[PDB]
Amino acid sequence: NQAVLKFTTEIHPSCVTRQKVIGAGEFGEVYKGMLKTKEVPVAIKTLKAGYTEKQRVDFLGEAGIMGQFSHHNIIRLEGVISKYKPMMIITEYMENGALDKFLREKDGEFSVLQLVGMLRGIAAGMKYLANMNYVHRDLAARNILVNSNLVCKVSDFGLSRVLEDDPEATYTTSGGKIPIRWTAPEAISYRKFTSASDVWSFGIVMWEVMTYGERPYWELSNHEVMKAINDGFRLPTPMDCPSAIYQLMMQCWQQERARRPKFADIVSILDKLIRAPDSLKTLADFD
Ligand SMILES: COc1ccccc1-n1c(-c2cc(O)ccc2C)cn2c3c(=O)[nH]c(=O)n(C)c3nc12
Numbered sequence: 312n313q314a315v316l317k318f319t320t321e322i323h324p325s326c327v328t329r330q331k332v333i334g335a336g337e338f339g340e341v342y343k344g345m346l347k348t349k350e351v352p353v354a355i356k357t358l359k360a361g362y363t364e365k366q367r368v369d370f371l372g373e374a375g376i377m378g379q380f381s382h383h384n385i386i387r388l389e390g391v392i393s394k395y396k397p398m399m400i401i402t403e404y405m406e407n408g409a410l411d412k413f414l415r416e417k418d419g420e421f422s423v424l425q426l427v428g429m430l431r432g433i434a435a436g437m438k439y440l441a442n443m444n445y446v447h448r449d450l451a452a453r454n455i456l457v458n459s460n461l462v463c464k465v466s467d468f469g470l471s472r473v474l475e476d477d478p479e480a481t482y483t484t485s486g487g488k489i490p491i492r493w494t495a496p497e498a499i500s501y502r503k504f505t506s507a508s509d510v511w512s513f514g515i516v517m518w519e520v521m522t523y524g525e526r527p528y529w530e531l532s533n534h535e536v537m538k539a540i541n542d543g544f545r546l547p548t549p550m551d552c553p554s555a556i557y558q559l560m561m562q563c564w565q566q567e568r569a570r571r572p573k574f575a576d577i578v579s580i581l582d583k584l585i586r587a588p589d590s591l592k593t594l595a596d597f598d
Pocket of ligand 1: 333334341353354355356373386400401402403404405406407408409453454455456466467468
């Protein structure tokens with residue numbers, strides 16, 4: 312990590328004030344705080360003393376990756392505390408939290424145009440990651456953060472730590488740990504994770520957004536989801552969903568990876584719909 316960490320600012324512990332717990336885990340927490348530079352609010356992820364070598368490499372490795380990105384729709388790294396304990400990753404603060412919880416608590420409070428604007432931001436962040444040769448593997452509303460301008464930013468970076476740390480990722484019969492109902496068939500079936508499997512996941516995120524955080528496939532078990540997808544079934548249209556948006560998410564769920572749009576296509580399509588907003592007035596039939 313010592314090369315990628317050169318892109319990161321080492322922050323002295325005195326400059327950081329932790330204030331409120333906003334997330335928790337086994338070996339650390341997530342805080343809202345302030346960062347001395349005037350003071351800016353920040354989000355802070357910690358790693359407490361007792362961590363293993365692998366945990367340190369994974370934890371600092373996320374910062375090394377995040378520090379190589381500069382994009383409006385990608386969470387911005389402020390710096391790290393790595394010389395002292397607890398270790399910390401310090402990012403910009405997203406006032407409205409995770410997108411999935413945000414939408415479930417704000418059910419029906421946004422216009423279609425605002426929801427589609429969210430999706431455009433997510434797709435722009437994903438296009439950037441893909442062209443930077445970064446495959447996310449865990450794209451889902453729970454990993455998108457929302458600020459007070461309603462800007463959505465992709466978070467949760469790293470190598471093995473991404474799917475290890477997510478409790479939605481479960482062990483398959485063949486030994487991989489994956490979040491089944493967000494994951495493309497080829498990634499489940501033979502561990503083929505690419506920007507095109509991220510597009511499948513993006514289609515699920517489109518459904519999460521337009522449903523205000525409905526849980527994909529409802530109470531179907533993971534095996535029943537895999538069986539339904541293999542047999543050709545797809546998630547049904549959300550309520551009050553523009554036909555163009557439903558058509559786009561259905562294209563993200565093509566079984567054949569080569570038939571899915573690229574993120575460049577997704578951004579282009581969403582930008583044209585937004586700039587001609589009457590295109591969103593035509594709604595797909597809700598059952
Ligand atoms: C989905 O966001 C997280 C997931 C797990 C742990 C922390 C956060 N996480 C991050 C984050 C994300 C990273 O990938 C790396 C470092 C950090 C600090 C920022 N925020 C925020 C945030 O800025 N505002 C929030 O309300 N919440 C709930 C947050 N949760 C996180």
